[PDB]
Amino acid sequence: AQFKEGEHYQVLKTPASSSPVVSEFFSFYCPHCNTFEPIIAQLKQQLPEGAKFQKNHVSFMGGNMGQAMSKAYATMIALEVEDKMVPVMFNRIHTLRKPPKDEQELRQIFLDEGIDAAKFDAAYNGFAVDSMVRRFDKQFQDSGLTGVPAVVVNNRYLVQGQSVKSLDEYFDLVNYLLTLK
Amino acid sequence: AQFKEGEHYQVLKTPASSSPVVSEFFSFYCPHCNTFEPIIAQLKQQLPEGAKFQKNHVSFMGGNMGQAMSKAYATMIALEVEDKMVPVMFNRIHTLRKPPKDEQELRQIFLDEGIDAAKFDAAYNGFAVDSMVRRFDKQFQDSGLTGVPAVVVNNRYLVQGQSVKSLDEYFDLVNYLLTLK
Known part of the structure; x- marks a missing residue:
């Protein structure tokens, strides 16, 4: 497929969410997290009905x-x-x-x-x-993440977004992960 | 040059070291930091005389x-x-x-x-x-880093190594940064 495990996303050692949720771990002291905001804004509006976006x-x-x-x-x-x-x-x-x-x-x-x-x-x-x-x-702590920003889909899908083409492809990846359980 | 600021490395808001030092921030709980060890081992031996390697x-x-x-x-x-x-x-x-x-x-x-x-x-x-x-x-805290592993050269050069070709090119970049003050 277009999105392969170990390339586009990494499976976390945590129980999948019982409901579609996109989580973003960040810190106000984190520079790129600030640069990441516009992208976060578009991704929310681009989310499929029923999914919730949660900032941590x-x-x-x-x-x-x-x-x-x-x-x-x-x-x-x-x-x-x-x-x-x-x-x-x-x-x-x-x-x-x-x-x-x-x-x-x-x-x-x-x-x-x-x-x-x-x-x-x-x-x-x-x-x-x-x-x-x-x-x-x-x-x-439970996700075992080593930094911010970090976008996890359904509690166990760490978006290793460093490989996405345009913002368009990024949304396609997140949207893709939301359906996987 | 082969290594451009904002592409291969990022300048940190900290006073440069008065002496050549390569620092690595990691955590024993960090998975990739474990995968990074062999690379760290070679980089030390490949370091130019006079430089010190410090793990944090x-x-x-x-x-x-x-x-x-x-x-x-x-x-x-x-x-x-x-x-x-x-x-x-x-x-x-x-x-x-x-x-x-x-x-x-x-x-x-x-x-x-x-x-x-x-x-x-x-x-x-x-x-x-x-x-x-x-x-x-x-x-x-002072380096303002947002994760691990992180390799800083001379206290203000964050190696944004996600762009290096082979391990060979990586060493060339670190070795290159060590001379810059």
């Missing part, structure tokens, strides 16, 4: 701000302010080259965007956010 | 055994039992598929190889090993 923030980059940065991401999902906050965060760290030195500074990034302080403080330190970050980390 | 173990893989696994590696350098212990460790985790579940089990791996318990316990919990692991982590 890893905590190994950024030193002692890694874990906090993961909570911030988890906070964006909880507050549904993901569409505006993701680019704002990728931008303040890469383009502006002004990384949040601590929790209070990280918090300020949200406050400067209009997100209410009481809303942020409740979610940032909440159970939902805590449960989500743990889930982010566990999934990364 | 990262702690982000292996969950709560990551940090311990880094100390174990640092322990191998301290006890100069690196030549025998590196392959033994890559082998017990990958080929034998029997990962050390805890510190005592990790310790046992050494004890089963003839390394004296008193010697291991002194170094494993020693200042030298502690100073080395910290150094491993700091270097990884």
Whole structure:
């Protein structure tokens, strides 16, 4: 076939998902993950009905701000302010080259965007956010992945996309993997 | 030239080394890092006189055994039992598929190889090993790397080796970068 195991994708030692899902592991401190955003945007819209796209923030980059940065991401999902906050965060760290030195500074990034302080403080330190970050980390450890960005299809298909022709072929590969179980 | 920036190698945002050094970031839990060993072996012997090869173990893989696994590696350098212990460790985790579940089990791996318990316990919990692991982590964070394996030349040249022809061309690239400052 056009997509062969060991060439276009690698099978992970994990139980396949009981439902179609495309997962992306990244970190706001990851440069190419920032460059990868436009491609991620198109891939979602290009996804077949029924499939869900899930972003997972890893905590190994950024030193002692890694874990906090993961909570911030988890906070964006909880507050549904993901569409505006993701680019704002990728931008303040890469383009502006002004990384949040601590929790209070990280918090300020949200406050400067209009997100209410009481809303942020409740979610940032909440159970939902805590449960989500743990889930982010566990999934990364269990998949045995060694870096980011990483796009896994149905929980066991690591897209070794370094061989795709155009963005068109890339979507064809992901779409192809979604049907395989 | 044969090796262009942004194609064969990427310049890192870090101060160049005051002396020729080839660094490899890896993890014993990293599969390709295991496959990469033979290539690492040849590259060292192929290195020009005066250059030093330094392995750096990262702690982000292996969950709560990551940090311990880094100390174990640092322990191998301290006890100069690196030549025998590196392959033994890559082998017990990958080929034998029997990962050390805890510190005592990790310790046992050494004890089963003839390394004296008193010697291991002194170094494993020693200042030298502690100073080395910290150094491993700091270097990884400062380089802004997003995965392993990763080969950096003179502290600021990330070998984007995914474009080299044969192993011969790879060595030519590394050797080429060592002269650049």
